[PDB]
Every structure is written in structure tokens, then in C-alpha cells.
């Protein structure tokens, strides 16, 4: 009954992309019984130096809806409340790469996601820094696998980002998750997450931000 | 001030796909000042004989957010309250094709969308009838153009539908809109609509349905 209701989420990221240091904080809530996510991200340092969509995947998979015949496959919630560490290396096709380490654990009643992001090799004439990315998101398949020795999961998927000239900027994600606690955790069979996201703005918010709605459900078994 | 607030939407579709006759009714509301859409679709005849996502585009572009420097390009709202007729022919790659005629006009305080859909040539071993389509949606670009002689717009875009085996079912849309009223209407310059949609289910709804959230904003000028 940790995720049986509506859970408050808090997100804090500190980033450095090509020297441009910045910070983002996010508040929202999630309902795992429905896989729904609702978060609001404010750039606490002023203007975000990278497109808001490139940070969607970095800014809580434990809120996925795992139908009941797939519950022994839910590593994410099996690691709670102590948590898990999520590390990734994201390669944006023909551009830079992000490196992120995050700790997501319950801190009281709130599920917290703290991250450190470092981006490098970003072209100034590229879509990322050139801010050529459109403000929206598509649906992707997130493929999971149990990582035996490490006692975790290896996740890996590709993301499609639309550019204003119609084209699509692809981003290769290489992900890993290992629990923080020393207790046993569910290693799952191979399977995937089906995610759908929609970005918008708050009509009454003055600060740079992104409003994100997201629906994620587990599948493949 | 027709679309300056929150407008109640009502949708009614009658369909025939390969002989399978069915009906859908939808209620929701839209806020054009924000391009937000929120609708709930119930299949009034029982079980929908085609995947719910193949009907998203058929089931109200006048709710698009048109930034203010693009207002003379908003044909959709320039045709109100009398309305416009939307006709389409949608070709699903290597499968059948839908034909739809719809009338969308204001009937009182409610913006109404009545449609007649006819689908044919659908493979039973195809993704459509074989119900192999995943329950989600991506973002697309809807390209508009003024149709001179006809006094309307010719719209045309392609849609991507994810299948459960990862792959993507493409759908080619050929669209036309002509006002119903005899009064002048805004013909616009070439431009496009950026749409994002997310599908979900009502936890308390027993009947076959689809819950859709959508954000659309105009761009290209």
C-alpha cells in the first residue's frame, strides 16, 4: 500500500550543459494504480539553456501501471521505500550526450527524485543548443531486462523528438537501476513500458517552466 | 468571444467498417485560448469493432491555439457559429481506408461534431481488424493550405500508430473543409498545427470507451 493511492512527487535536478549551469525543481503527483503522472517544472535559475523536451526522460518509473498478472515484474516498486539509483547516458544523434545519476526514494510521504546531469559535446548549431526542438512529445517503448549479477535492471530505449522543420531528432538512452537497500528485490522477466506524454504551459506561471502529463503502463507478458 | 472561454463539445459518429456497424458518442470540453481538449468517448453499440486510436482524428480543429499574430489564419473559428463541413479519406498503409463526412457547427452553447464514417477493404489479418494497435498516440504536424475556388482549406498530414510488436502503422489523411454559411471566411496562408494527444481509461466507466486529452497549437508563421 505504498503506491495504492495518490503520491506527492518532488523533483530536483542540477545541470551543466557545455558550461551552462542551471536548476529545475518540480512538483506534482502520481497515481500508479492508473499510471498517471502530473508534474510542473520550474527552472529555478532563470531561462533553461536547453529545450524542455530533452529533459523529460531525466525528470520516476515506479508510477507505471503494472497490470496484476505482471506484479512480480515491478522492480521499481519492489525497491521502495529505500529506493534505487538510476544512471543513464543519453546520446542525441549527431550531437552531444547527457550523463545523469539520480536517487529516487521515499522521503516521508513524498517520492523524491534528485538528479545531477552533465551534458557535453553539444553543438551550438545543433538542434539542442540551437533550440530547434518543438514543444511536444511522442509515445515510446521502454525495454526492461533483469541485470543478474548487479541485482537490478538494464533499461534501454530510443526517443523521437520533433523539430520545427518536421524532421525528428533521435536520442539513444542507456539506463541502469540498482536498489539502494540491501534487501531482496524483484528481478523481472523481459518486458516493456508503454509511455505517452503531453507538454503544456501554465497560463498563470511567469517563470520558465513545463507542465507535463504522462501515462505509463507495463506490458509484454 | 465565441471561443474565449471553455466550450462544451458533443460528438456523435455513426460507422460501418466492413459491415460492422457501430456508434460512438462523446462529451468533453475545449479551451481554445489554451488549445486544450478533454473528451470522453463511449461506444454506444457495445464493443467497438476497430481500435480506438484509429478514430482519434475523425472524432474539432477550431480549438487549436492560434497565437495572436496568426489570427487571420484561423479558418476554423472564422466559419463559426454556422460551421464547416469536414470530409476526409484516410488510407491506412497496406490496409483499408476510411471515408468520413462531418458537420461541425455550434448548436446552442455546445460545439457539435456529427460524423458518418465508412470503412472498406480492411484486412481481417491486418492491424486494424486484427486489433494489433497499441493504445496510445504520438504528435503530428497538420499541414493547412487555402483552397481558393472552393473558399476553404485543404489539409493533409500522416499519422503514426504504434503496434504492440514495436512497429508503426502509418495512415495518410486527405482532408477538406468548406464553410456551411454563405458569409466570408478567412482563407489562410500555408501553415501547420502541432498536435499532442494522450489516451486513457475511466476507472469508473464500465462501457467501452476512450478518454482523450489533446493539446493543439498553430504554427509556421
Amino acid at each position: 500500500e505504498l503506491f495504492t493511492g495518490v503520491v506527492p512527487i518532488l523533483v530536483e535536478l542540477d545541470g551543466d550543459v557545455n558550461g551552462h549551469k542551471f536548476s529545475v525543481s518540480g512538483e506534482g503527483e502520481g497515481d500508479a494504480t492508473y499510471g498517471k503522472l502530473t508534474l510542473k517544472f520550474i527552472c529555478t535559475t532563470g531561462k533553461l539553456p536547453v529545450p524542455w523536451p530533452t529533459l523529460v526522460t531525466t525528470l520516476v518509473q515506479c508510477f507505471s501501471r503494472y497490470p496484476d498478472h505482471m506484479k512480480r515484474h515491478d522492480f521499481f516498486k519492489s525497491a521502495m521505500p529505500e529506493g534505487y539509483v538510476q544512471e543513464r547516458t543519453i546520446f542525441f544523434k549527431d550531437d552531444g550526450n547527457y550523463k545523469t545519476r539520480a536517487e529516487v526514494k521515499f522521503e516521508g510521504d513524498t517520492l523524491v527524485n534528485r538528479i545531477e546531469l552533465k551534458g557535453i559535446d553539444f553543438k551550438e548549431d545543433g538542434n539542442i543548443l540551437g533550440h530547434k526542438l518543438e514543444y511536444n512529445y511522442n509515445s515510446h517503448n521502454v525495454y526492461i531486462m533483469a541485470d543478474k549479477q548487479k541485482n537490478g535492471i538494464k533499461v534501454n530505449f530510443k526517443t523521437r523528438h520533433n523539430i520545427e522543420d518536421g524532421s525528428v531528432q533521435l536520442a539513444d538512452h542507456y539506463q541502469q537501476n540498482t536498489p539502494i537497500g540491501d534487501g531482496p528485490v524483484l528481478l523481472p522477466d523481459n518486458h516493456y513500458l508503454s509511455t505517452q506524454s503531453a507538454l503544456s504551459k501554465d497560463p498563470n506561471e511567469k517563470r520558465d517552466h513545463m507542465v507535463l502529463l504522462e501515462f505509463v503502463t507495463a506490458a509484454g507478458i
Side-chain angles (χ1 to χ4, degrees), chain A residues 82-93:
Chain A
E82 292 167 272
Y84 56 71
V85 164
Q86 185 155 298
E87 308 177 82
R88 288 210 181 96
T89 319
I90 313 190
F91 303 86
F92 291 100
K93 192 176 200 184

Side-chain angles (χ1 to χ4, degrees), chain A residues 43-46 48-57:
Chain A
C43 176
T44 54
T45 52
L48 196 60
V50 279
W52 273 111
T54 60
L55 296 179
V56 176
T57 59

Side-chain angles (χ1 to χ4, degrees), chain A residues 137-171:
Chain A
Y137 222 80
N138 300 284
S139 293
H140 310 109
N141 295 120
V142 164
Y143 294 94
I144 322 274
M145 281 168 279
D147 179 300
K148 271 321 89 157
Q149 87 287 5
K150 304 296 173 191
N151 190 60
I153 61 185
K154 267 184 171 157
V155 179
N156 142 91
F157 57 107
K158 232 177 230 68
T159 234
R160 297 175 100 266
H161 299 303
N162 294 190
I163 322 306
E164 58 205 15
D165 80 291
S167 43
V168 169
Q169 169 71 95
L170 298 169

Side-chain angles (χ1 to χ4, degrees), chain A residues 17-46 48-115 117-164:
Chain A
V17 199
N18 269 48
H20 309 274
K21 314 167 69 58
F22 63 85
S23 279
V24 175
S25 162
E27 5 91 36
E29 57 184 42
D31 196 337
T33 298
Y34 301 128
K36 200 214 274 215
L37 273 203
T38 297
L39 286 292
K40 182 185 170 175
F41 299 97
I42 300 299
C43 176
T44 54
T45 52
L48 196 60
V50 279
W52 273 111
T54 60
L55 296 179
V56 176
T57 59
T58 294
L59 270 356
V60 127
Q61 311 160 303
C62 47
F63 286 97
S64 318
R65 179 176 76 88
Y66 266 82
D68 30 296
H69 65 270
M70 279 183 98
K71 298 199 147 305
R72 58 178 182 96
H73 299 278
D74 205 337
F75 166 78
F76 304 114
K77 299 183 194 71
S78 90
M80 296 299 162
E82 292 167 272
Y84 56 71
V85 164
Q86 185 155 298
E87 308 177 82
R88 288 210 181 96
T89 319
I90 313 190
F91 303 86
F92 291 100
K93 192 176 200 184
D94 309 302
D95 215 339
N97 63 98
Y98 283 171
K99 280 234 67 173
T100 73
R101 191 212 211 246
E103 280 197 348
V104 9
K105 61 195 199 273
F106 263 97
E107 301 186 32
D109 66 332
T110 301
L111 188 284
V112 174
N113 185 11
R114 303 164 184 288
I115 318 141
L117 169 147
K118 180 205 161 186
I120 54 167
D121 288 355
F122 281 89
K123 280 163 195 162
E124 20 299 313
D125 67 277
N127 311 287
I128 284 60
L129 285 184
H131 272 252
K132 308 182 175 184
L133 256 50
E134 227 151 36
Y135 192 79
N136 50 38
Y137 222 80
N138 300 284
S139 293
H140 310 109
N141 295 120
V142 164
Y143 294 94
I144 322 274
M145 281 168 279
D147 179 300
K148 271 321 89 157
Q149 87 287 5
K150 304 296 173 191
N151 190 60
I153 61 185
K154 267 184 171 157
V155 179
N156 142 91
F157 57 107
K158 232 177 230 68
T159 234
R160 297 175 100 266
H161 299 303
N162 294 190
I163 322 306
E164 58 205 15

